[PDB]
Amino acid sequence: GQFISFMQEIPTFLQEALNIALVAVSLIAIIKGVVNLYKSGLFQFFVFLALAGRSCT
Amino acid sequence: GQFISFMQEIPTFLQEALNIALVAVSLIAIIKGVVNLYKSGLFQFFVFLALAGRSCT
Amino acid sequence: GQFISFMQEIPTFLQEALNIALVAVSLIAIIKGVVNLYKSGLFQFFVFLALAGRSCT
Amino acid sequence: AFFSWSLGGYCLEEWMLVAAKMKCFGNTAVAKCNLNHDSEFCDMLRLFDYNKNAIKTLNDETKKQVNLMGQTINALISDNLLMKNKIRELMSVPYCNYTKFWYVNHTLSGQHSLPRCWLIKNNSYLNISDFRNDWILESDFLISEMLSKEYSDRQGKTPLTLVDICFWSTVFFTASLFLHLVGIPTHRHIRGEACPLPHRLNSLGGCRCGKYPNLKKPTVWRRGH
Amino acid sequence: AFFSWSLGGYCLEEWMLVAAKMKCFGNTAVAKCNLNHDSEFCDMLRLFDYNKNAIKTLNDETKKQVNLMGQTINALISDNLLMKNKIRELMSVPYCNYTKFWYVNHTLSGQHSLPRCWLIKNNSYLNISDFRNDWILESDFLISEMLSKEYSDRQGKTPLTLVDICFWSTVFFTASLFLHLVGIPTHRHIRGEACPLPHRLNSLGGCRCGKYPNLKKPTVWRRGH
Amino acid sequence: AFFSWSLGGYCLEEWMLVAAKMKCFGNTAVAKCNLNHDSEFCDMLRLFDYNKNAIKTLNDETKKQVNLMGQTINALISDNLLMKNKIRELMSVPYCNYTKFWYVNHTLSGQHSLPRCWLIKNNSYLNISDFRNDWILESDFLISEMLSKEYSDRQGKTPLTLVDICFWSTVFFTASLFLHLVGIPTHRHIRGEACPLPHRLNSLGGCRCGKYPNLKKPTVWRRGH
Amino acid sequence: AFKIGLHTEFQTVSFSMVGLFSNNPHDLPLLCTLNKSHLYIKGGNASFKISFDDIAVLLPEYDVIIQHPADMSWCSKSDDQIWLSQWFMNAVGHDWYLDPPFLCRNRTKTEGFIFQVNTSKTGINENYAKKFKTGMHHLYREYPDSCLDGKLCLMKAQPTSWPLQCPLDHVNTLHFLTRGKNIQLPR
Amino acid sequence: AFKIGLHTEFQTVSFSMVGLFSNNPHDLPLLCTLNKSHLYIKGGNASFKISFDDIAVLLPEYDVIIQHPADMSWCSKSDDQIWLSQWFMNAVGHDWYLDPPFLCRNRTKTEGFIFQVNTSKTGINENYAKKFKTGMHHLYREYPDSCLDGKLCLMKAQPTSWPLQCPLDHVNTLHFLTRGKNIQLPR
Amino acid sequence: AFKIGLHTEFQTVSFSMVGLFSNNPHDLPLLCTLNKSHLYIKGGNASFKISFDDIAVLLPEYDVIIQHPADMSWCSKSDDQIWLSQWFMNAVGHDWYLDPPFLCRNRTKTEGFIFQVNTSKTGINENYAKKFKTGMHHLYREYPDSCLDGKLCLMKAQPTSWPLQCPLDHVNTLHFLTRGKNIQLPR
Ligand SMILES: *[C@@H]1O[C@H](CO)[C@@H](O[C@@H]2O[C@H](CO)[C@@H](O[C@@H]3O[C@H](CO)[C@@H](O)[C@H](O)[C@@H]3O)[C@H](O)[C@H]2NC(C)=O)[C@H](O)[C@H]1NC(C)=O
Ligand SMILES: *[C@@H]1O[C@H](CO)[C@@H](O[C@@H]2O[C@H](CO)[C@@H](O[C@@H]3O[C@H](CO)[C@@H](O)[C@H](O)[C@@H]3O)[C@H](O)[C@H]2NC(C)=O)[C@H](O)[C@H]1NC(C)=O
Ligand SMILES: *[C@@H]1O[C@H](CO)[C@@H](O[C@@H]2O[C@H](CO)[C@@H](O[C@@H]3O[C@H](CO)[C@@H](O)[C@H](O)[C@@H]3O)[C@H](O)[C@H]2NC(C)=O)[C@H](O)[C@H]1NC(C)=O
Ligand SMILES: *[C@@H]1O[C@H](CO)[C@@H](O[C@@H]2O[C@H](CO)[C@@H](O[C@@H]3O[C@H](CO)[C@@H](O)[C@H](O)[C@@H]3O)[C@H](O)[C@H]2NC(C)=O)[C@H](O)[C@H]1NC(C)=O
Ligand SMILES: *[C@@H]1O[C@H](CO)[C@@H](O[C@@H]2O[C@H](CO)[C@@H](O[C@@H]3O[C@H](CO)[C@@H](O)[C@H](O)[C@@H]3O)[C@H](O)[C@H]2NC(C)=O)[C@H](O)[C@H]1NC(C)=O
Ligand SMILES: *[C@@H]1O[C@H](CO)[C@@H](O[C@@H]2O[C@H](CO)[C@@H](O[C@@H]3O[C@H](CO)[C@@H](O)[C@H](O)[C@@H]3O)[C@H](O)[C@H]2NC(C)=O)[C@H](O)[C@H]1NC(C)=O
Ligand SMILES: *C(=O)CCCCCCCCCCCCC
Ligand SMILES: *C(=O)CCCCCCCCCCCCC
Ligand SMILES: *C(=O)CCCCCCCCCCCCC
Ligand SMILES: *[C@@H]1O[C@H](CO)[C@@H](O)[C@H](O)[C@H]1NC(C)=O
Ligand SMILES: *[C@@H]1O[C@H](CO)[C@@H](O)[C@H](O)[C@H]1NC(C)=O
Ligand SMILES: *[C@@H]1O[C@H](CO)[C@@H](O)[C@H](O)[C@H]1NC(C)=O
Ligand SMILES: *[C@@H]1O[C@H](CO)[C@@H](O)[C@H](O)[C@H]1NC(C)=O
Ligand SMILES: *[C@@H]1O[C@H](CO)[C@@H](O)[C@H](O)[C@H]1NC(C)=O
Ligand SMILES: *[C@@H]1O[C@H](CO)[C@@H](O)[C@H](O)[C@H]1NC(C)=O
Ligand SMILES: *[C@@H]1O[C@H](CO)[C@@H](O)[C@H](O)[C@H]1NC(C)=O
Ligand SMILES: *[C@@H]1O[C@H](CO)[C@@H](O)[C@H](O)[C@H]1NC(C)=O
Ligand SMILES: *[C@@H]1O[C@H](CO)[C@@H](O)[C@H](O)[C@H]1NC(C)=O
Ligand SMILES: *[C@@H]1O[C@H](CO)[C@@H](O)[C@H](O)[C@H]1NC(C)=O
Ligand SMILES: *[C@@H]1O[C@H](CO)[C@@H](O)[C@H](O)[C@H]1NC(C)=O
Ligand SMILES: *[C@@H]1O[C@H](CO)[C@@H](O)[C@H](O)[C@H]1NC(C)=O
Ligand SMILES: *[C@@H]1O[C@H](CO)[C@@H](O)[C@H](O)[C@H]1NC(C)=O
Ligand SMILES: *[C@@H]1O[C@H](CO)[C@@H](O)[C@H](O)[C@H]1NC(C)=O
Ligand SMILES: *[C@@H]1O[C@H](CO)[C@@H](O)[C@H](O)[C@H]1NC(C)=O
């Protein structure tokens, strides 16, 4: 439950430049990772498997 | 010789989820790195240099 | 000013293999990053914007 | 036995506290004076522990009619601290008389500081305007102590060798990533011609199978076809 | 009050030092004996603090004509340490008499070690050739202490959870990087034919729109067109 | 001199141990009571050190016929601890009499805990069924102490600034890796036409060299040719 | 008890002296101050009241001049009272064979128990006045001194009942037990 | 010595008392218990045996009633024995000029050395019996008490040879040296 | 003060004793050694010089044989000198009613103040010579002993003015204040 404690204590920990830097880096990395996964096409393969045999569009 | 001590004490350290997670990540990274090196072709260049002048197959 | 202190105390800290390994890794990473940025072409886009409307060469 | 605890912990009941209730202190907080000889709170705590164990022994009915000596009391209370307090009193500077203690509390996780002695002067209690400079320092030290305690708690479980191996594996993975990203030329192509593979040309522009004559034709390293 | 400092710090003036000047010690260095009962330097420091506070009380003119007792002095000096030193003297081994102290200094940041006692023997001072084995150890310990102090100073500010989240985000980013780098086949191509998209072929080689008949033609997974 | 060691170490010979042999303790283990005044083992160790140095001084033949006082012995043994033990005995609770000590041993690296006192009761020795709850705690603390000691040993050598620089260099390298992986469009292509390079078109669809007229033709950003 | 900073609170703890002083199985000495002249000491079954004023009640030409602790046995009928008297005098720091004596009444009278000490602040006795002074300064944790540089300052001690209002001080008990040795407290 | 957990072993260490007690260049006091009545003390060259029983061997109307330590000089012919006797009596915690005396034999007899203490458990002496009791309770680390509430409990001390079987206790030596002061041990 | 290693320097600190010894508001005892025979003690307003040699100046058949501290009052005219004498004798560790006495001059003479102790190194007194010896060994931090196994070693103490050259030792002051108790230092 350390995540819950951190979400409770965000205002106190936000006062440090290192803290905001690290959290910004993590958020940017997570969203870029989502972008790269999308640009991969593994999800496209899963959709293709889930679509095979339903419609030819 | 810390590596030897770790290889001796694997059974005690295996009882932690963080430990198994880290070792699994390291092993996966090492084998994927081998795969990527193979897919590079630097080894192919070394083989080409070691083959130049022997046979034209 | 920890950077200045480190640049002052380089000769004492150079005596450790881990230290030279880490600094070599960092320098190699920085120069390779410069190389990769060059090979990207974002700087090429900036040059293109700074050149648009001056000459058609 | 007595107060030599080697580590939800120590609690005190009604006949000890003036509020006539029961309060419990965390084991981490209590352990901070298992070796300290300069804390008024823990001397009084040892006195109360001796009282409780005397009660227990009377209940056990040992019946050893042993008269108490002053030496036992002198071996529980830091006489140096008492002399220091009396010296302070004679010099007209603030001191305390083992009655009231205060601490900074951390409500989120129940962590608290070790109580200090609320100093007196001229038969009065030092108040907020003079005691201000201590609560802020105590609270900052409390937060720092909590963070360091959690860091050490996770520290004492994971081998450093595993961390180092993981880091080096990561750097190797990244180097291989870039190395695959750029790619390396594999063979030679004659300038203006197509791919001569599988016939691998030499530095002279020809092949040893006879298909490509040694005409000193220009050759350029290429990766793809 | 007296020497129980809970943390540019303590300074001593002319009438304390033989050099007739003023020297200041860092708070980190001074705090190292707020609980130590085995350091000759800090016993003498407590004596000098008592002298200074007596001066201050006389200036305040409390006029309490209280005769001094030997008990107050015995409650400031570690009598155990004095007895140990006298035992050493009777046994003809080196000892010190609270006059001269030495320390290793760090000029770059002003950090210094806690002074030790320059031991004597036969009414002389132990010299460099016998005292060598201590300065090197003291200096190494000083550098190690400085590095550890800085590490703990940054340690007590940043939550470990944030570090762990950053590390896991980085490893996820790298895995996604490679995963995009290689790329995965998306659809099927009949061997020898062009791209049948958007008509998505089945495993049988045909399409359910009727454009591609079910002729059991060979199919290979491909990513690009 | 005497027992104030500032850090394969201290060893004891036949006439000290009941087993009539010689045992050596690690310096890290021994150093744990250079300031502790609450350990029966180290008081007896100081007594034995005084005996050994008396032997050495007699061998030196100082011939100082100085009669021993009880004060010297009282300045070596923690009289507070002795009074506590006697209080325990009078109260019919377990205690120890400085004869038998036990410790948890780590065979792989030779690391051991500091010996404790095997408590007695009713002229007998407390046995395994009552002493169980301590060995497990001692062993866990031993392993944690070893891990923390190694972590601090590597901690006190490497500057944190270097670690931070390495981490930031790694994150920059990864960002550049992705940034090269995707790639950015470089110039403009007229919809349906070929690559107009090196003639760099404007936003209007033409070129300022006159080759491409300003016909407001559609333009799309492209990277490759 | 006011909230301090954020997520951190301020709370104090105070201990009760009645339980400690009424729960310890062995008896303990009690020292008390009432108003500014009524000083009280209690040990075992002897409860003495001490006052300082300018009245002479014993004279060397009429009663016992106590010079040695052996001679103390002629002042009381109870061993507990004699033990408490010697206890207090040695706690104060009186040297029997080096300082001027004090006066006591002999047991063969139906009057009671009274003992008087001269602590005047003039003449030779001035010096003694210092010593004794400091003594009391190290026991009661305070000293409501009730005699100035006037001609006489005579201290009288007399046994009375224990008032049921005295503050239950304990620093005085600690100092009492700390100073003197070879003392066993009964039940 | 059983293996505990994994890779960790259990081992104990025990020290030998004979080397310490026979190696220290200065002499040290010895206190011993034998069976349940033979208590032994030894210091310098004086070896005393102490027993508790119901036999009267000295009477106040026949021998010396020791009241002051100066009067102690008439009981022995050796300074070491006198020093040890005073040492033990002050370690036990006897107040010479405040408690009932004890009896000793005068040197001008060819009998020997004997001294007797009354520690009966009745009458007035009951109280004294407490004090002395606690004394011995703080030295021998144990107390095989050998006299109940019976009419008399007389303690006798007499010098005998040192038996070569006594356990070499040392907690008693520590307490002996701790309690009394201004004591120099010879060689 | 030589540079050690790199970036680290060697520096020492030494404290001045004159300020401490001349600044403390209360008076403190002083002990000094001059040449190898002139031992000096000073307390309050009494400044005594101690020497050891082979001259007899007092005889038991001519002056006072001090046996008890009460009898000490016949040797001086000043309370400070008597207090310092008793202070020193109890610091050395002399048992008044157990060891051979020492000799002093009675006040009713216009000569002065002198007191003599026998610490010869032969006969019975040999043993006493040990005790006293150790005493001085624990106060002066040194001992320039000035009497060998010769027939007599008599110590004489006489009050003189304080020389203005004595080293301002303080370990001796610490040991002096540590050993004895119930001592109040005046201003
Ligand atoms: C020294 O410790 C004593 C206890 O030994 C403390 O005494 C306490 O003094 C305070 C002063 O305000 C008392 O508070 C008030 O007292 C009365 C009676 O209860 C009443 O006005 C209020 O209800 C309130 O409680 C407190 O009761 C009293 N406690 C005891 C047990 O005597 C004292 O605080 C310490 N010394 C000084 C100078 O503060
Ligand atoms: C014990 O502490 C005393 C102080 O109580 C120290 O005394 C010091 O001894 C040194 C010895 O060299 C003296 O240094 C020299 O002394 C004279 C007079 O000043 C002169 O030749 C030089 O100018 C130089 O200072 C020093 O002055 C002296 N200080 C005092 C205050 O007496 C002593 O060092 C310690 N004991 C031993 C055995 O070293
Ligand atoms: C207090 O410390 C003493 C030493 O001063 C310890 O005495 C030891 O007691 C044990 C009890 O079992 C003895 O073990 C056995 O004793 C005899 C004689 O050796 C024999 O049956 C066995 O060979 C075995 O050793 C041990 O010898 C004895 N040691 C000494 C030096 O007396 C004692 O353990 C401690 N007190 C208690 C109550 O345990
Ligand atoms: C308790 O101690 C006080 C201390 O002052 C005694 O009072 C003092 O008694 C002496 C007796 O000799 C008085 O001395 C005489 O005073 C006058 C001159 O002042 C004159 O009559 C004589 O020449 C002689 O010096 C002294 O004055 C007096 N102090 C005061 C301030 O009056 C008191 O007697 C003692 N009480 C008992 C019962 O011992
Ligand atoms: C050693 O101490 C004991 C303590 O009991 C002495 O025994 C007690 O001696 C007294 C002498 O007065 C006895 O008192 C008398 O007892 C009866 C009535 O009980 C009667 O004869 C008298 O009225 C008087 O009260 C007392 O009873 C006796 N205790 C016992 C339990 O019999 C003993 O004499 C002391 N020994 C020496 C040598 O001093
Ligand atoms: C100070 O103490 C010394 C300690 O030696 C005293 O000197 C000793 O005095 C005694 C007196 O009885 C001498 O004993 C006699 O000696 C000879 C044989 O040696 C003979 O005359 C007698 O048979 C008797 O034993 C003893 O010899 C002498 N010591 C020396 C070394 O000569 C000294 O008298 C004491 N001074 C004072 C003032 O008490
Ligand atoms: C109490 O035990 C709560 C523990 C919280 C663990 C934090 C998990 C963080 C997961 C981040 C994954 C990165 C994004 C895919
Ligand atoms: C004792 O000194 C042994 C030290 C062991 C060092 C560990 C080396 C780990 C190497 C991992 C490299 C990553 C894979 C290429
Ligand atoms: C004193 O405060 C100096 C602090 C120095 C900070 C170090 C900054 C290092 C920057 C490295 C960036 C990586 C290369 C783009
Ligand atoms: C701190 O405050 C909390 C608030 O809920 C309380 O429950 C807790 O007991 C306090 N901690 C103490 C008194 O140690
Ligand atoms: C103490 O308080 C009282 C009132 O209770 C006041 O008269 C006096 O001046 C104060 N003294 C000091 C020293 O503060
Ligand atoms: C302390 O000072 C504050 C200032 O706000 C005041 O409110 C408070 O009453 C004072 N305390 C006492 C006990 O006078
Ligand atoms: C260490 O040396 C420096 C050199 O500049 C000096 O300024 C500093 O005061 C010294 N530190 C001390 C004495 O603590
Ligand atoms: C001490 O030094 C002196 C000279 O000052 C010398 O004669 C003597 O031998 C030395 N003694 C020792 C024990 O070193
Ligand atoms: C200590 O030894 C060194 C060796 O170089 C010497 O120079 C120095 O003078 C010696 N010190 C003394 C005080 O003799
Ligand atoms: C721990 O056990 C090992 C086993 O080989 C032994 O060699 C070592 O001495 C022991 N450690 C001690 C006694 O400190
Ligand atoms: C002690 O052990 C004995 C047997 O040696 C037994 O009779 C007795 O009851 C025991 N006493 C206690 C208090 O355990
Ligand atoms: C302690 O208890 C265990 C239980 O297994 C038993 O084997 C052992 O003998 C007991 N020890 C003694 C000394 O009785
Ligand atoms: C002492 O004060 C109490 C409490 O107010 C009172 O009852 C008593 O009469 C006072 N004593 C005197 C002598 O005034
Ligand atoms: C009065 O006291 C003296 C001194 O102790 C004493 O000797 C005397 O007997 C007492 N008076 C009577 C009448 O007993
Ligand atoms: C005391 O016990 C020992 C050892 O068994 C024995 O020799 C001796 O006779 C016993 N003493 C008595 C009086 O029974
Ligand atoms: C018997 O002892 C007394 C008391 O000390 C003593 O005076 C007397 O001289 C001794 N008897 C003989 C015959 O000497
Ligand atoms: C003691 O030494 C001092 C200093 O040199 C000198 O003045 C004095 O005369 C010496 N005393 C004797 C008796 O020689
Ligand atoms: C000499 O001293 C004695 C012993 O104290 C004393 O009684 C006597 O009075 C003194 N001499 C004179 C003449 O006073």
Numbering used by the authors:
A (entry chain A), B (entry chain K), C (entry chain F): 2 to 58
D (entry chain M), E (entry chain C), F (entry chain H): 252 to 258, 268 to 485
G (entry chain L), H (entry chain G), I (entry chain B): 61 to 247
In the authors' words:
New World mammarenaviruses (NWMs) are enveloped zoonotic agents that can cause human hemorrhagic fevers; they include Machupo (MACV), Guanarito (GTOV), Sabia (SABV), Chapare (CHAV), and Junin (JUNV) viruses. NWMs exist as quasispecies and contain a bisegmented, negative-sense, single-stranded RNA genome whose small (S) segment encodes for a nucleoprotein and a glycoprotein precursor polypeptide. That precursor is processed by the human peptidases SPase and subtilase SK1/S1P into three polypeptides: a stable signal peptide (SSP), a receptor-binding domain (GP1), and a membrane-associated domain (GP2)6,7. Three copies of each non-covalently associate as part of a mature, 3-fold symmetric homotrimeric membrane integral glycoprotein complex (GPC) that alone decorates the surface of the NWM envelope.
Selection of CR1–28Fab-bound GPC yielded isolated particles that, when classified and averaged, showed membrane-installed GPC with consistent Fab-bound ectodomain features, transmembrane structure, and visible luminal domains. Processing from these particles ultimately yielded a C3 symmetric map of the CR1–28Fab-bound, PV-membrane-installed GPC with an overall resolution of 3.8 Å. Collectively, these features reflected a map of the pre-fusion state of a mature and functional JUNV GPC trimer, demonstrating a full complement of CR1–28Fabs, an ordered SSP-containing integral membrane structure, and intact luminal domains. The CR1–28Fab-GP1 complex resembles that of its crystallographically determined structure, with a Cα root-mean-square deviation (RMSD) of 1.1 Å. The CR1–28Fab binds GP1 at its receptor binding interface, facilitated by interactions between a pocket on GP1 flanked by Asp113, Ile115, and Val117 and residue Tyr106 on the CR1–28Fab. Three glycosylation sites are observed on each GP1 domain, at Asn95, Asn166, and Asn178, with the N-linked glycan installed at Asn166 abutting the bound CR1–28Fab. A myristoyl group installed on the N-terminal Gly2 of the SSP is observed as a linear density protruding into the outer leaflet of the membrane bilayer. This anchors the SSP to the bilayer and dictates its topology in the membrane, matching that of the GP2 transmembrane helices.
